[PDB]
Amino acid sequence: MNSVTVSHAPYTITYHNDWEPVMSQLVEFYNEVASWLLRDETSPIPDKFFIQLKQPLRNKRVCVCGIDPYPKDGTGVPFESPNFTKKSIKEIASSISRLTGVIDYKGYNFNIIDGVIPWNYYLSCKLGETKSHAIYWDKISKLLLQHITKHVSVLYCLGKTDFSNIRAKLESPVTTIVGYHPAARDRQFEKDRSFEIINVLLELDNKAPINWAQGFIY
Amino acid sequence: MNSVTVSHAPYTITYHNDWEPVMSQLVEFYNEVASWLLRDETSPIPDKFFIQLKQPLRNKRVCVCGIDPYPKDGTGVPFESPNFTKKSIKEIASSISRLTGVIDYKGYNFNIIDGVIPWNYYLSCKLGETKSHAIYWDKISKLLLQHITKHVSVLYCLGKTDFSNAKLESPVTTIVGYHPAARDRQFEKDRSFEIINVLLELDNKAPINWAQGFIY
Ligand SMILES: [Cl-]
Ligand SMILES: [Cl-]
Numbered sequence: 001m002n003s004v005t006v007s008h009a010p011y012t013i014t015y016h017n018d019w020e021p022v023m024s025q026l027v028e029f030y031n032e033v034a035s036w037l038l039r040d041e042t043s044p045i046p047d048k049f050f051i052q053l054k055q056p057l058r059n060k061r062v063c064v065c066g067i068d069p070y071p072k073d074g075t076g077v078p079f080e081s082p083n084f085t086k087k088s089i090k091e092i093a094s095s096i097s098r099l100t101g102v103i104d105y106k107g108y109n110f111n112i113i114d115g116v117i118p119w120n121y122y123l124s125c126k127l128g129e130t131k132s133h134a135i136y137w138d139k140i141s142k143l144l145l146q147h148i149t150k151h152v153s154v155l156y157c158l159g160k161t162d163f164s165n166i167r168a169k170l171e172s173p174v175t176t177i178v179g180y181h182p183a184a185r186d187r188q189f190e191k192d193r194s195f196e197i198i199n200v201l202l203e204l205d206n207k208a209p210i211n212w213a214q215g216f217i218y
Numbered sequence: 219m220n221s222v223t224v225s226h227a228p229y230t231i232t233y234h235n236d237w238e239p240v241m242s243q244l245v246e247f248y249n250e251v252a253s254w255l256l257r258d259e260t261s262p263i264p265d266k267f268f269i270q271l272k273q274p275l276r277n278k279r280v281c282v283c284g285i286d287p288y289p290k291d292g293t294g295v296p297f298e299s300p301n302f303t304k305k306s307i308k309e310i311a312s313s314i315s316r317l318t319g320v321i322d323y324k325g326y327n328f329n330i331i332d333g334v335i336p337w338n339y340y341l342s343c344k345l346g347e348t349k350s351h352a353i354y355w356d357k358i359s360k361l362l363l364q365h366i367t368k369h370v371s372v373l374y375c376l377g378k379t380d381f382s383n384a385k386l387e388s389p390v391t392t393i394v395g396y397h398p399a400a401r402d403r404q405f406e407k408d409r410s411f412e413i414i415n416v417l418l419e420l421d422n423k424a425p426i427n428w429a430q431g432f433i434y
Contacts, residue, residue: 173384175392193420197391200416204393 008034009046018057022147029140037136040126043069048076049123057151061115061207062198065145065155066181067162068122071130077111078118084108084217091182091189093216099195100213107217115210119148121157121166131162142170149174153205154198158182175201226252227264236275240365247358254354258344261287266294267341275369279333279423280414283363283373284397285380286340289348295329296336302326302433309398309405311432317411318429325433333426337366339381349380364388371421372414391417 003014004023008031015023038046066078070086081089084107093108110118121141126132149155149172157163159181167176179194199209221232222241226249233241256264284296288304299307302325311326328336339359344350367373367388375381377397395410415425 176389178389191422197417197420200413200420201391204413 006034007031009038010049013050013053015050015053016056018151019053019147022143025143026140029143033136033140037124037133040132042074042124042133043072043127044074044076044124046124048074051076052078052117052119055111055117057117057148059115060117060148060151061153061202062210063117063119063145063148063152063155064110065119065121065157065163067120067159068125068131068133069120071125071128074124077109078120079110080118081107088182095190095192095195096212096215102213102216105216105218108215109217110215113210113212113214115208116215117148117152119145121145121163145170146172153207154201156194156198160184175205177201224252225249227256228267231268231271233268233271234274236369237271237365240361243361244358247361251354251358255342255351258350260292260342260351261290261345262292262294262342264342266292269294270296270335270337273329273335275335275366277333278335278366278369279371279418280426281335281337281363281366281370281373282328283337283339283375283381285338285377286343286349286351287338289343289346292338292342295327296338297328298336299325306398313406313408314411314428314431320429320432323432323434326431327433328431331426331428331430333424334431335366335370337363339363360386371423372417374410374414391421393417 001015001017002020003012004027005012006027013023013026064079066088069078070081073081073086075082079089079092084090089108093105096108097103097105110116122131122133122137123140124133124137149170153175155174155176157167157176157178160178162181163178167178177194177197180188180192182189195212202209219235220238221230222245223230224245231241231244282297284306287296288299291299291304293300297307297310302308307326311323314326315321315323328334340349340351340355341358342351342355363386367386367390370390373390373392375392375394378394380397381394393410393413396404396408398405411428418425
């Protein structure tokens with residue numbers, strides 16, 4: 001819809017109107033930091049940092065959140081792996097396959113599920129190094145996730161360590177689940193039932209469940 | 219097992235060891251407020267304010283919580299009505315009767331159910347006035363419920379307006395259902411008891427057998 005300019009790359013940020021209330025501060029915060037983060041090659045590329053701000057928030061009832069993008073090949077859409085190559089998304093798809101009974105599929109994407117907004121807490125990383133840009137995104141990450149949590153009924157974070165003390169410092173009343181990361185040891189993600197629990201919590205808040213099968217690609 | 223003294227009535231508080239971490243602060247907080255509570259006649263009596271601290275917490279997976287004790291005849295055990303007279307507990311027993319298929323009973327008590335700790339958020343009220351002691355118990359109530367929510371998997375609160383307010387600061391799965399005396403039969407259509415067991419099953423915990431609460 002609308003656009004806003006910033007003094008460093010990617011220069012323009014196009015945003016859906018639901019994000020308006022935070023854009024002014026986003027610009028201030030990004031300008032203060034961008035120079036530091038663009039030194040490094042990144043995942044995703046700078047033109048893709050903010051494409052998830054084109055998504056609406058008012059139709060969203062669940063946020064599924066990872067700490068930062070894939071160390072390589074980040075597309076700007078959290079969790080997205082267009083050629084279905086990344087371990088995280090393969091493990092997620094398996095979980096939902098067992099849950100939904102859908103056995104034959106070629107990919108999975110959170111971004112095409114009604115009511116779900118997939119999110120990366122930090123919006124970039126130094127290529128090949130997870131959590132490398134935490135110190136730069138800090139204030140922005142808090143700002144944007146606070147805004148998301150005013151719309152969604154449930155926040156689902158993936159990674160017990162990654163999200164230990166970040167969720168305590170979010171200052172939001174929103175119902176929160178911190179589950180295992182897909183690559184957690186001893187198959188703990190495979191025994192994790194957060195996808196089911198989400199729908200129970202949504203039902204308790206007088207909201208429709210998420211149909212997790214909508215994420216499949218054929 | 220152990221005991222602690224306090225400068226106003228009931229003077230001694232006996233507590234199960236699972237409560238040890240909070241007793242020191244409980245004494246500080248109770249001493250700083252007890253004058254205000256004891257001016258009034260109370261439900262329950264002061265000797266019964268803290269008897270629920272004799273219950274263990276480690277074997278508990280569900281906390282069932284009401285806002286404060288019965289306006290009259292509080293026994294110190296939340297929800298307990300020994301002569302099965304109180305509306306709340308009669309409605310709860312009906313709900314579980316329909317759920318479990320147990321049709322003939324004389325009473326119901328949460329306190330004899332494995333895995334359940336029944337709780338009153340405020341530990342007293344001025345006789346006949348619900349919520350009258352909220353302002354006195356405030357800090358203590360928050361302290362004790364926070365401690366309970368470190369052990370239990372699910373917190374079930376009864377009363378939508380009573381428990382609307384966030385101010386607990388705990389990750390625990392929380393359900394805020396209708397109060398048993400809610401209008402238009404809303405408590406009768408409330409399925410929180412079933413939902414609790416689903417949530418528990420999802421957290422790899424055994425369900426609560428709600429039929430254990432019946433008295434014959
Ligand atoms: Cl983890
Ligand atoms: Cl109610």
